[PDB]
């Protein structure tokens, strides 16, 4: 039981628990009346009206294991409608960021902490920021290209947020979860909801694609596999809710992650297609048919490899001609019309197969000309016209093992009109490193000819994309957003305030 509060009379008792329900106990006849589901567990109940007018309360959002996610909620006592709910923007980081200790329940889960497991976790959680440098705390964020809302894949959901009005406009669930059907209780708190891991838009903006993974319950016969479910969603410009047209169970067969996704541009099929790269490196071309209202696989490319590279990235050539694909230590250039290697009659060693020094983290192209590749150790910049590298930068001191593979991609984006920004992060210490970090934004153009601008932010930075208003947006641990960009009058005064025992 998380919080109790009496009314101003003293005849009513609000409650609060891991069950997501505000129960109003009558103390006179011991009945109760309760709102069933309130978007996560409720921390602190509070009645504010002197007449008993408003119920006001605090929310935890226990779906995120990596961040305290507080939604201040207020209600009318009469109707019990959510009136003027206030919520900060909610990312989801890769690990538990900074000193955040999950609220207390009965039994220790991966979603909550016990009493005996309370201090044994907090002592351990400091050591993960002391023993390891492996911590990244990175957030996948995608920008809506026509409405400039900023969708956050809070797990099994999307918080549709916009930073101009600084306000949450939606919270849509995107999975057949267990979410609003039941507040999870202490043995059931081990069951974690399916996790949206990828969320991209087409360049149209009329389509949003959804990759998630549903998890099994433990102690079952099928508690080993993982269903990789893909979903392709639509809405109009008028409506803010999304609508599902093709759910896809298991792309690339069963138990295969499709971890990297790039959408198609307007050149190829009016941006109504998406690509999915495996850990094996298979390429499928999902796109949209017209006479059917639904999606199919127009083109496949399925290799079977002896090994699994969990770091893949891929880039599209703006003409719609060819597909750059990055596997570990190795680039591939695919003719889209064949899904094979770019076979050349020139034989001028412009080979589709490249051989890089370390495992690829990003593949980004400024134009048809440039191509910027970050390995696990280094960053390189290779032109397309001549296949010779231009600029070398040893990111090995800044990034040794700082990132789980693939997560470098969300830090580094390319404004297609100006150029690149990579996002370099330090931790800083005096005399064991501190908890505090320091991130530097560096601006790049034309496969890193010059540094256009070095901006040094005092805290951490977890994500960068570039908004189509020619500007880069970045998050932070404190969930802040920053932009890298370019007589009668005296008779009038008295009537203003005056109008408004025996």
């Amino acid at each position: 039981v998380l919080s109790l509060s009496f009314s101003h009379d003293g005849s009513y008792l609000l409650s609060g628990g891991w069950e997501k329900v505000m129960s109003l106990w009558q103390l006179e006849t011991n009945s109760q009346q309760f709102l069933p589901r309130l978007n996560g567990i409720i921390i602190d109940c509070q009645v504010l009206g002197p007449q008993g007018n408003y119920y006001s309360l605090i929310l935890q959002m226990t779906e995120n294991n990596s961040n305290s996610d507080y939604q201040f909620l207020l209600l009318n006592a009469s109707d019990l409608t959510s009136k003027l709910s206030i919520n900060g923007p909610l990312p989801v980081f890769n690990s538990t960021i900074k000193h955040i200790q999950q609220p207390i329940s009965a039994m220790n889960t991966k979603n909550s902490n016990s009493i005996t497991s309370l201090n044994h976790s907090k002592k351990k959680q400091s050591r993960k920021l002391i023993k390891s440098r492996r911590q990244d705390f990175t957030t996948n964020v995608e920008i809506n290209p026509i409405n400039k809302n900023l969708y956050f894949p809070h797990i099994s959901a999307v918080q549709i947020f916009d930073f101009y009005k600084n306000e949450q406009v939606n919270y849509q669930y995107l999975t057949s979860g267990v979410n609003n059907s039941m507040g999870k209780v202490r043995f059931e708190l081990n069951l974690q909801d399916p996790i949206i891991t990828d969320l991209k838009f087409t360049k149209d903006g009329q389509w949003m694609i959804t990759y998630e993974i549903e998890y099994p319950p433990n102690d079952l016969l099928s508690s080993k596999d993982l269903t990789h479910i893909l979903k392709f969603w639509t809405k109009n410009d008028n409506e803010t809710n999304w609508n599902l047209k093709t759910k896809v169970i298991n792309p690339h067969g069963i138990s295969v992650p499709i971890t990297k996704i790039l959408p198609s541009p307007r050149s190829v099929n009016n941006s109504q297609g998406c690509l999915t790269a495996d850990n094996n490196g298979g390429l499928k071309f999902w796109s949209f048919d017209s006479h059917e209202s639904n999606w199919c696989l127009k083109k496949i490319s399925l290799p079977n490899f002896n090994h699994f590279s969990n770091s893949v990235s891929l880039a599209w050539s703006q003409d719609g001609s060819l597909i750059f694909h990055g596997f570990d230590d190795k680039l591939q250039i695919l003719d889209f019309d064949t899904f094979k290697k770019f076979e050349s009659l020139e034989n001028t060693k412009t080979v589709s197969e490249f051989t890089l020094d370390s495992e690829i983290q990003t593949v980004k192209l400024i134009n048809d000309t440039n191509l910027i590749v970050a390995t696990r150790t280094t960053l390189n910049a290779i032109n397309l016209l001549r296949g010779q590298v231009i600029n070398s930068f040893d990111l090995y001191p800044f990034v040794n093992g700082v990132y789980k593979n693939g997560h470098m991609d969300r830090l580094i984006t390319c404004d297609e009109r100006t150029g690149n920004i990579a996002l370099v992060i330090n931790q800083q210490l005096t005399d064991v490193p501190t908890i505090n970090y320091k991130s530097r934004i560096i601006i790049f153009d034309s496969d890193l000819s010059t540094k256009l601008g070095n901006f040094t932010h005092h805290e951490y930075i977890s994500w960068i994309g570039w908004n189509y208003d020619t500007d880069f947006i970045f998050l932070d641990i404190e969930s802040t957003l920053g932009v890298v960009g370019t007589x009668x009058x005296x008779x009038x005064x008295x009537x203003x305030x005056x109008x408004x025992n025996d």
Binding site: K83, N179, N180, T246, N250, G253, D289, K299
Partner: protein, 475 residues
């Protein structure tokens, strides 16, 4: 109309209005330039406001009464500061004010003179040969208030000092509604229920021009220096005039005309519009008794112009906490699948006594009752030979009509499975030559794939059966 009597201050920043409220007349001042819950309640049921006038140091309005006395109202606090009481008790039909002197009309035709400074009745005063009088306005000669104008269907210019009627003006058939001095020569008379304003001359004693509105004239206002006269019409319209005093010249029709029609299409009545130099003010009643206003610049405006107002005539209610339908604006929106198509990534698309010829016949056309006559055959020597004498193009179409029956009927892939293999056995060499096997044999590849994934799960269930079955049989 709900507003009985309304009047603006000079310079047009406020108006008083007098309306009824449960058989008790109340007065109230709103602002017009961009509410006011304060009101002055008249105590008795019977006393009624009869004529109304402002004062240009508190901003006070003057209330002519049914009672026989004159209330004097300060607007800052709802208090009536002092009372100007005629000893006789008839209603006061007109009130007038300039400087310290005040002037009013008894219903027994008696002039009166009050001081605002000295708070005192100067003279009980009557004159001959004016038997009914209901509108009095004083001429602005200067500090000399003398030779004031009074009228009821006919205007008399009457001096104070010699206390006689100097000029006698022809007038109307109705009693006169509006009587205002524009210029030091010219002034307007206007009747009740008539479409005709006169413009007379004080010195000459003639009519110069007349003015004509399209319906009956209810309330009058005029600009500073005789440029603009804006007439509130009883139908609800503002028939204004531009340069009425300049030179068919006998009667002058209205120059510009202002209507107000709401957004749903209803006509809204206009009462008591104010005009100043080059800035027009409209009023109308938005609710039953609440007046809303609009300043507009009128020399820009065309000859006919309908100010259109959004009125909530059929406006459906938008509660800010509520969504467009049913749920809250802060409630989460549920995952609702509905009519989604569910596909796998394995589902490809868009990338000798024989039975041969009858099987070949039901594949040329699509025929389903005739296929099932074929597939009852189960001798493998028939199964070998029937596929063998078949066109190789037809064998590819046969496999598609197999996997559809294999998928939709689970037990059916027992006996049919031999009839799929020999298709692949005999025509394998042709089947290399077709360029896209995965496209054409997609429904075959999809059905065989979904059986393949059950292999680790079913072999897992075998042991855990045979844990128990090898156990409970012995003991």
């Amino acid at each position: 109309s709900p507003v009985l009597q309304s009047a603006y201050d000079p310079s047009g920043q406020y108006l008083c209005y007098v309306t009824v409220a449960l058989d008790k007349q109340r007065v109230g001042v709103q602002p017009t330039q961009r509410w006011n819950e304060n009101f002055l309640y008249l105590e008795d049921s019977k006393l009624k406001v009869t004529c109304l006038k402002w004062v240009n140091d508190t901003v006070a309005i003057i209330l002519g009464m049914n009672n026989g006395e004159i209330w004097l109202y300060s607007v800052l606090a709802n208090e009536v500061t002092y009372k100007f009481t005629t000893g006789n008790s008839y209603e006061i039909k007109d009130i007038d004010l300039m400087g310290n002197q005040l002037w009013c009309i008894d219903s027994s035709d008696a002039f009166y003179q009050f001081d605002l400074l000295q708070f005192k009745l100067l003279q009980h005063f009557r004159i001959n040969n004016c038997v009914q009088l209901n509108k009095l306005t004083i001429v602005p000669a200067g500090d000399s208030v003398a030779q004031l104008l009074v009228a009821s269907h006919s205007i008399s210019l009457i001096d104070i000092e010699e206390k006689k009627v100097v000029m006698t003006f022809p007038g109307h058939v109705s009693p006169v509604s509006t009587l205002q001095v524009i210029t030091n020569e010219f002034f307007i008379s206007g009747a009740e229920g008539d479409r005709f304003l006169n413009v007379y001359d004080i010195h000459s004693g003639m009519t110069k021009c007349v003015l004509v509105a399209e319906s009956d004239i209810k309330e009058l206002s005029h600009s500073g220096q005789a440029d603009s006269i804006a007439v509130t019409t009883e139908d609800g319209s503002l028939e204004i005039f531009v340069d009425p005093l300049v030179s068919g010249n006998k009667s002058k029709k209205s120059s510009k005309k202002i209507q107000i029609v709401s957004k749903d299409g209803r006509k809204v009545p206009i009462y008591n519009a104010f005009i100043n130099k080059d800035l027009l003010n409209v009023s109308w009643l938005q609710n039953a008794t609440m007046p809303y206003f609009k300043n507009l610049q009128w020399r820009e405006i065309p000859n006919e112009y309908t100010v259109e107002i959004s009125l909530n005539w059929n406006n459906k209610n938008k509660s800010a906490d509520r969504d467009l339908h049913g749920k809250d604006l802060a409630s989460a929106t549920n995952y609702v699948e509905g009519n989604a198509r569910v596909t796998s990534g394995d589902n490809f698309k868009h990338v000798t006594g024989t039975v041969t010829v009858i099987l070949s016949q039901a594949l040329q056309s699509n025929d389903h009752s005739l296929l099932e006559t074929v597939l009852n055959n189960r001798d493998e020597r028939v199964i070998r030979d029937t596929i063998f004498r078949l066109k190789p193009a037809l064998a590819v179409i046969l496999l598609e009509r197999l996997a559809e029956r294999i998928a939709r009927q689970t037990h059916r892939q027992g006996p049919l499975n031999v009839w799929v293999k020999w298709c692949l056995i005999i025509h394998g060499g042709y089947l290399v030559s077709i360029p896209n096997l995965m496209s054409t044999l997609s429904s075959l590849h999809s059905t065989l794939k979904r059986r393949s994934d059950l292999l680790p799960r079913l072999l897992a269930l075998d042991a855990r059966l045979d844990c128990t079955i090898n156990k409970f049989k012995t003991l």
